[PDB]
């Protein structure tokens, strides 16, 4: 699941991490 962040770790993780926990 960390490929991902490995293309938008400063929008797809940025929006999901906050989702998770402001």
Same mark, same amino acid.
């Not at 699941?1 to 940025?14: F, I, S």
């Given at each position: $699941?960390?490929?991902?962040?490995? *293309?938008?770790?400063? +929008?797809? @993780?940025?929006?999901? +991490?906050? @989702?998770? *926990? $402001?």
């Amino acid at each position: $699941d960390t490929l991902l962040g490995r *293309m938008l770790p400063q +929008l797809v @993780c940025r929006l999901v +991490l906050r @989702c998770s *926990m $402001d």
